[PDB]
Amino acid sequence: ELTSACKKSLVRIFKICDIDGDNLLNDYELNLFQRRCFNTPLQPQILDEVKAVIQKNVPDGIYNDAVTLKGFLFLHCLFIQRGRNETTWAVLRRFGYNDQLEMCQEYLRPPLKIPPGSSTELSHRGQQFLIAVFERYDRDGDGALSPEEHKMLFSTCPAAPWSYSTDIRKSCPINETTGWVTLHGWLCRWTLMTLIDVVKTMEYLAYLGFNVHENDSQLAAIHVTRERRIDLAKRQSSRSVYKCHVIGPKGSGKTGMCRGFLVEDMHKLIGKEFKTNVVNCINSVQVYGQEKHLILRDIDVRHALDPLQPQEVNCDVACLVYDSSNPRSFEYVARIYIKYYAESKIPVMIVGTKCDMDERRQDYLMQPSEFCDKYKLLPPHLFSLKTNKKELYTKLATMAAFPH
Numbered sequence: 135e136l137t138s139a140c141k142k143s144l145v146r147i148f149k150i151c152d153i154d155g156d157n158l159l160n161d162y163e164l165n166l167f168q169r170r171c172f173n174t175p176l177q178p179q180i181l182d183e184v185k186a187v188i189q190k191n192v193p194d195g196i197y198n199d200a201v202t203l204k205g206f207l208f209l210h211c212l213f214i215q216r217g218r219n220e221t222t223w224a225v226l227r228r229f230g231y232n233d234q235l236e237m238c239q240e241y242l243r244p245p246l247k248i249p250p251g252s253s254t255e256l257s258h259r260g261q262q263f264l265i266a267v268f269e270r271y272d273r274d275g276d277g278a279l280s281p282e283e284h285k286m287l288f289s290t291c292p293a294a295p296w297s298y299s300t301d302i303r304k305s306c307p308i309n310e311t312t313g314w315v316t317l318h319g320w321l322c323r324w325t326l327m328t329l330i331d332v333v334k335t336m337e338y339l340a341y342l343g344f345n346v347h348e349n350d351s352q353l354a355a356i357h358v359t360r361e362r363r364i365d366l367a368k369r370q371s372s373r374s375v376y377k378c379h380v381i382g383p384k385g386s387g388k389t390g391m392c393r394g395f396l397v398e399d400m401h402k403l404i405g406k407e408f409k410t411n412v413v414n415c416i417n418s419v420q421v422y423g424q425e426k427h428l429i430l431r432d433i434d435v436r437h438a439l440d441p442l443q444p445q446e447v448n449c450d451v452a453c454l455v456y457d458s459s460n461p462r463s464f465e466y467v468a469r470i471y472i473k474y475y476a477e478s479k480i481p482v483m484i485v486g487t488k489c490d491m492d493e494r495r496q497d498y499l500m501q502p503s504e505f506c507d508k509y510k511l512l513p514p515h516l517f518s519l520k521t522n523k524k525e526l527y528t529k530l531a532t533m534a535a536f537p538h
């Protein structure tokens with residue numbers, strides 16, 4: 135008696151309303167979402183009348199004095215055959231469904247005007263919701279999400295916003311022993327998406343049930359920040375998420391640098407080729423007492439005469455990487471800086487990798503130390519994976535967070 139499309143909707147709503155992740159709708163959430171859909175408290179007499187009917191007609195419908203999914207589906211299947219579809223339709227409407235039982239576009243994509251220069255970040259409520267969601271689908275409570283848990287989480291979505299195996303497990307911090315996405319990495323992946331694709335973030339937040347939980351549009355999950363002068367306003371809006379473009383020639387070792395941002399032990403990335411092309415890596419660092427998220431975009435390696443796109447040049451901080459063991463490697467960095475960054479307002483940091491081996495001379499006309507000295511740049515940062523030092527990442531974020 136229940137439509138296959140209607141059942142799909144009622145299932146998602148059950149998962150959203152299951153705030154304990156125990157496959158049950160206890161008294162609390164039943165009353166809470168009652169005001170979400172009907173703006174009235176659920177009077178105790180009705181709830182008893184509801185449970186009694188479910189218990190009477192449906193086995194395994196009431197477990198531990200709580201409504202199960204099998205009983206929840208029956209109740210609305212009973213509502214439609216008793217001439218009260220408006221009760222069911224009031225619930226479907228609140229969780230973002232229209233007359234065609236499809237997610238409303240105005241419910242998924244609310245209008246958000248982003249001024250030039252402004253960035254998109256997660257708000258306090260947006261973070262809290264994502265934290266709440268995380269700990270619900272962390273059934274075993276190991277403080278991390280398994281690929282089985284990560285699938286259930288986005289079962290209320292058409293698909294996952296990212297691959298578990300080829301994205302979040304390689305672009306975000308994970309648990310060292312289990313190899314699963316921690317709470318920290320969870321917030322990192324959402325922070326990355328929110329900055330580069332806010333519309334997708336809000337679209338997925340609606341699917342996860344942010345609108346119903348927060349009793350507001352997903353605009354409350356997005357916090358728009360921008361770099362402003364010495365404004366004496368009481369409402370601070372300083373940035374906390376910066377993006378760094380990592381540009382270098384082939385074999386520069388800049389890829390291994392990006393991945394090292396995510397692991398405490400970099401002694402396992404020394405002699406390793408990367409089979410997966412991770413575009414954006416992200417982690418947080420402490421900058422003067424404040425938490426700052428840094429995104430290390432691995433710009434696609436090309437020839438030295440090949441042009442760089444404006445959207446590849448324009449960033450918060452440019453990290454030009456060359457190989458110290460390759461005499462013909464620094465010439466790319468010198469070529470790139472002069473053409474694209476020499477006359478820009480973007481802070482640039484030159485990094486020499488693989489300094490563990492003997493730093494051979496560069497077959498260029500100027501040496502890296504002299505080149506930086508000529509264009510008033512900081513001395514070339516010697517980076518190595520055998521050292522496990524992470525001052526570079528903290529430095530990069532600081533250059534993006536501060537003048538010039």
Ligand SMILES: N[C@@H](CCO)C(=O)O
Nearest residue numbers: 151164167168171225
């Ligand atoms: N659908 C529930 C309220 C919202 O979860 C009920 O009417 O029993």
Ligand SMILES: [Ca+2]
Nearest residue numbers: 272278279280
């Ligand atoms: Ca888990």
Ligand code: NA
Nearest residue numbers: 152153154158
């Ligand atoms: Na629950």
